[PDB]
Amino acid sequence: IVNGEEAVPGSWPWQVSLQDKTGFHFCGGSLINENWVVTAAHCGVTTSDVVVAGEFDQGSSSEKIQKLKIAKVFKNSKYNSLTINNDITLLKLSTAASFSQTVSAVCLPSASDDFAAGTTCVTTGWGLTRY
Amino acid sequence: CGVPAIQPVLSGL
C-alpha cells in the first residue's frame, strides 16, 4: 500500500500471507473461519503454497506464527484470465487455524448488501509502500 | 467475525 501506515500488530487478525515453497510472500488472503482462506484467483495458489497467519512484523522473531498447509485449492470456475473478472479463490486448510487474539475471521457480506460509493473502507497488506 | 480482539488504530501524523 502506497501512502498507507503501519497497522497495530494483530489488529487485522484475518490477514494472512501466502508464501511459496521458498518462504517468499507472494499474495495476501483473509481467514473467513478456522479452515478457510479467501484470496484472489490471479495469485495462482497451489497446495505447495503455505498460509501464514498471525504475522504482522516480518522484522520480528517472537510472533506466534502459524504456518498452515493447504489441502485443496478452489478457484472460481468463472475466473477469466484476460479480464481478471471473478477473481476469487478459496483455500481449504489441511489443519485448522487456531484462533487467538491475533488470528480470527473477517465477516462475509450478503449478496444483497449495498456498500455505497463514498463509503470509507480499509485495505491492508504487505505490498510496496512506494512504486 | 470482523471484530479484532486488538482494535485497529487508523491514524496519520
Binding site: 484472489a40 471473478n86 465477516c107 | -
Partner: protein, 97 residues
Amino acid sequence: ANTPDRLQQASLPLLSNTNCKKYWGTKIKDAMICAGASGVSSCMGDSGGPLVCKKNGAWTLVGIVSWGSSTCSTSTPGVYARVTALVNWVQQTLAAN
C-alpha cells in the same frame, strides 16, 4: 527497498462503477468494485488481500485486491473483486466441502 517490515493499512473510499469506468473504461465488470484514487493505492504484493467495510460494527469483506495502477498511482482507483457478487459461490463451496 519499498517492502514494508510491518503490515500496512490505509483508509480509502469506494467508487461507483460509473466513476471507476471514467478511469478504466470497459475493463470494469459487474464482479469488480473500485476504491481509492484518493491518495493511497494498493501495490505489488497486496494482491489477494482484503478490502473491508463496517457492517453492524464489524469489518466485512467487501473486496479482494485484484489489480490497479501500473505504477500504483494514488490518483487512480484500485480494482477489487466484488465479494457481494461472489459470496454466493463462497458459501456454496464451503457447504459442499
